[PDB]
Amino acid sequence: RXADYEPIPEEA
């Protein structure tokens, strides 16, 4: 190595 999320509202 080497390098599910809720959408972010239009708040930035």
Next chain:
Amino acid sequence: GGADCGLRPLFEKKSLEDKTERELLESYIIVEGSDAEIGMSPWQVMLFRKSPQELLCGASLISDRWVLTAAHCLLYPPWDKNFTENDLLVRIGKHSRTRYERNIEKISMLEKIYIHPRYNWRENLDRDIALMKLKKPVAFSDYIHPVCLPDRETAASLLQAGYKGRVTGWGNLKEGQPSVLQVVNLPIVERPVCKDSTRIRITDNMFCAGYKPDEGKRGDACEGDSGGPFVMKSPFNNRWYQMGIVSWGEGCDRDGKYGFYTHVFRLKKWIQKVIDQF
């Protein structure tokens, strides 16, 4: 912010101790981790992609407008990775991995990204470090607070084999994903032992950490954790200092292998220079 660095609003400032800090202090002379406490690592930052909304890496807040992370998070040609300011955003003050934390977390846009000019992505990730300037200063709170950068003497006395540091992140729990920020305390390992565990050429700009096969205990950073902070609590002034940045490792938590970290103090002059000029 920097005069109040390393003192957590919900712990040091209230004279409260977290569940595992005593472990670090007693040693002074994320795979297999545990859920972090609220406000336990107020400098933890989440590096996030704008296009497919995804966690990229961890990072840390060193001031109201500067975020520190690993350069491989931003530039890694072997995997066709090369991000610019507009491809990312930082989320500060988080605890939940996926949940957008209304009234708690703050999102910032990047103004400029600076990658160490001698960052060696071609061979061993030597000087794996990058600074990111936030477009606007972030307001501190109980959940948002900068960590301190070490000075010569703090690095000298704390960066010793056997002394334990702490790693935090929302990365993989095995070589699935955690619901909240994870934390693991790991001991710094002797350089010879680090060298003898890999074919990769390790330099003075790195240090390795982790338990040895015979020690019983386990733990390591994993995908998703890179770029994050390796911190230690100074027993002299009780502030938290970032000694390393999660860099690379061969797998996650493999016996006989160790996680490698960027040596923050050795690259401090580059940090100071960048912030003093830009």
